[PDB]
Amino acid sequence: TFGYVHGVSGPVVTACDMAGAAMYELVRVGHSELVGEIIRLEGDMATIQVYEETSGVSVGDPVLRTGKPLSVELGPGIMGAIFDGIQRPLSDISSQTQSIYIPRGVNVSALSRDIKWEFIPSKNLRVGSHITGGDIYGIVNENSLIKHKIMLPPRSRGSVTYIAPPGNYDASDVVLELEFEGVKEKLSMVQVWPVRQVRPVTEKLPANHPLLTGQRVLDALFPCVQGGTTAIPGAFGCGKTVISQSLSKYSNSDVIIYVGCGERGNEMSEVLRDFPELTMEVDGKVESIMKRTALVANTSNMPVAAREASIYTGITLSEYFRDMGYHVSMMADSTSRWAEALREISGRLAEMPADSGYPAYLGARLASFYERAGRVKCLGNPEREGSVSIVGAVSPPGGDFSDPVTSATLGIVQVFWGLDKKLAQRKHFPSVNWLISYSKYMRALDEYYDKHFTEFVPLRTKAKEILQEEEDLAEIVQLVGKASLAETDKITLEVAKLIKDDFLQQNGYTPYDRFCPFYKTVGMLSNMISFYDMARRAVETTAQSDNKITWSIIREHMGEILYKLSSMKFKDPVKDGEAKIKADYAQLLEDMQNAFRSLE
Amino acid sequence: YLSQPRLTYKTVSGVNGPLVILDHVKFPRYAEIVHLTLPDGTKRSGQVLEVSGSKAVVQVFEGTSGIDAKKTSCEFTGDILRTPVSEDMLGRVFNGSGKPIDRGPVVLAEDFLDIMGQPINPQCRIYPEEMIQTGISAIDGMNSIARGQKIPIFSAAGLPHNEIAAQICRQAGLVKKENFAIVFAAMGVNMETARFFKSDFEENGSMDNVCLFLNLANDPTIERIITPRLALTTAEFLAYQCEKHVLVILTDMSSYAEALREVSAAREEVPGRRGFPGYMYTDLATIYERAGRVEGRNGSITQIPILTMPNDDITHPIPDLTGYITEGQIYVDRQLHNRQIYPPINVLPSLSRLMKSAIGEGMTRKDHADVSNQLYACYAIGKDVQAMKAVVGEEALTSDDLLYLEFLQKFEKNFITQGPYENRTVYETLDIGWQLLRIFPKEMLKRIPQSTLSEFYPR
């Protein structure tokens, strides 16, 4: 399984006596076991691209051939760990060496083999039974939140010949043995899957269930769906933290994966420092977010292969848990950094560049990356279902949208949560642009909304009309000063302000506004629009002659009602239950309609 | 140690520009250091760039003139370039190769480190905290440098970017509400400026805390590539092993990039965007990101790369690829220079992303954050009013506009204009800020909370 180094021209190492090797196989070059891949082959010689520095590699050094291509090691212990882009545990490398550096040629197993996991068989299988790929034959108890279901690796099947009894096993033991056509396969709790291959599913289903983030904006006006794909701008002042924390903390997904692609060292530190400090209430207990999270960390000075592979390692980990029946939400901190890594490799290989210097296949790689997301029917007899969502961010040089990476991304993702910096400067959070943002899942969710909430859909339509009209009126107001302006337009302007102030704006540093349940979001919007409609009628039905109602009359007449509408965001779901908050909102509507009644 | 006798080869297959192609070489390494002896007794250094079987190709640091293929001998060391490091080398001046040029002895090593090193494990990277004051008000009260960030100075050719760099070396230090060192590397520096740096540091007593590397414009271009690696290797030793804070200033990274392009051509690589290597991004990140704080140790490294913008275009790959992987920018302008303002630093286009953590109670002073934001707004408005004045005249202005013009004139004269030998600590810079802010009545200082005004505004 060894060959020899024939020569080094830089980061590219030529091997000889390496006839038995496949393209994009893995090699460990030299006495330090440098990680690299085989790209070009000719005769019994192979051209190796080495990820790390090749200084010190000699002619005649050994090359160890590893049969598996670039792959992710999947099994118990994946949760709570931080990985390199090529699946190297950073929390073990820093703790097994007492160093601050990642050793050159470091070789730490992705999943430690010194942990004795609590494994319980499915108790449904027997020796002699038939098992197929994707089947679950036992569960490992990792923590209080996520059960780690042990699946038969894809592309394997047969009759079960041995089942381990319940007990404490590590990742190097044998848990299940199966025989197919006389060939016996001994399986541990760990499976390996090539990172560039898509894990098969029974069928790919439409995405219909909303992604229940805690923000009123980026939900009511611009829905995302479990299994859907969106894009988030990444600029210093855009306030992207709000989405990252809200999505990872309060989402209705089961597993969070955060993927770095190649960011500034200090930015990776902020993410690695923040995440371990995040908690959420679960069964009444406050639990660490890292018990249901996995994180992949890559800084700009990491090997380019890892920065390019990081995005595929992340989604491979996501699919692994998807196949368990979990809903997984993966965030790519910057897909622009990934695209930069991809262009660097294309340049290093002297490939013909295309648009703005990027590889010709940039678009194909992004399209095939995002296509891997979605709600699926899983493999295996348990007939379970799950999904992968992607909320990958874009940060093109200059902030422009002409960069092929952002332009291609926007043509692929179905939701765009356009953020802005001006809003942040005005201290308006979350910093959502509104006019640029869009969601193409609105039709997919119409069945969910009709079934569970009924009035939500016409309300969000009216809300967009009111907000858009406020923008449309901007030129008239600037040139007029609200003097030569219709009273019906004054209602739109002031109500749109109410929406912008006490609905779309959300203050995550307050205990009552940490998470806004959907029923509260639609409750608040219903009463605000119901007021809008009543105010429009109050003016229009009396605007003929003699005695007419104006906005100044409405505002002065029922100022307490306009205040009560603004006060609605303070209804803390932790102390005031669903029935109490709905009851208070129902009373507000009645008080509101009755206040208008006195005007007619 | 190796304790293996060295082999010296007289077998030369040919010589092509900076490269010497050797033959029959036994198990050569890539990046191996070798020494040449020419027929005239002249010695040269070089490094092995390609090893294709027994045909090792070495790049000679100095010129290859005089080298034949019959008598020139090549001695192999059996190892790669490892720099002798110690604490004692602080206060010394070296050339790009790591040799002393201050008439002192060769470094008596405490260890040997591979100058390429390794990336710092992100899991143990600590977000930057306290501030390192520079002594220059324009970048202490407006865009401070956090103890662990990497913030570049972009300048056009002809601007006094080297005089500011020297001023930072003389004035920079800790806030002091003995453990601070500066490592200074100049790449492609001309003889006149090299003298400036060396003499200015020695004369003003700062040298005790400076480790200076000078790579001159007429020095080997490959040495220019290791120069910043030697500076950072020293910085890593001093910072992380000897528990102290190191400020690293890399001057004229544009000249580094040009030397890197030359190395790429030596390898016969096809040029990338605008002639530069396709791996320029990862090479700059390799240099820049070897900095910051680490868990469990009290040391830190900061960087202030200084870059000349070709044709004063921030779009150029050199400042573009740098800015894409650094945290903000200082930005030295030309208009301020032509107006004879020193330092000529423009606060409006500059940014320090880590300022939020650098400053505040327990690090500088309570009012630091508030003074900075208000000064920025007042300067931006003053410039806006000045532009208006040019259109409407003096008589068309109201009292508030005149106050902003008074601020604008006194801000540049008192706050930005400093001189090369006046060291303004963070507390004096803020006090100057308040003296300028007290031009306005309290109600015009919209960005300063009333609690801060009541404490600091009067008196």
Partner: peptide
């Protein structure tokens, strides 16, 4: 870029023929 790449390949071909 195209022309320079082809030039480098032609040089490589010449070098192989010489061996």
């Amino acid at each position: 870029f195209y022309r320079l790449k082809k030039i480098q390949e032609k040089k490589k071909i010449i070098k192989e023929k010489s061996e």
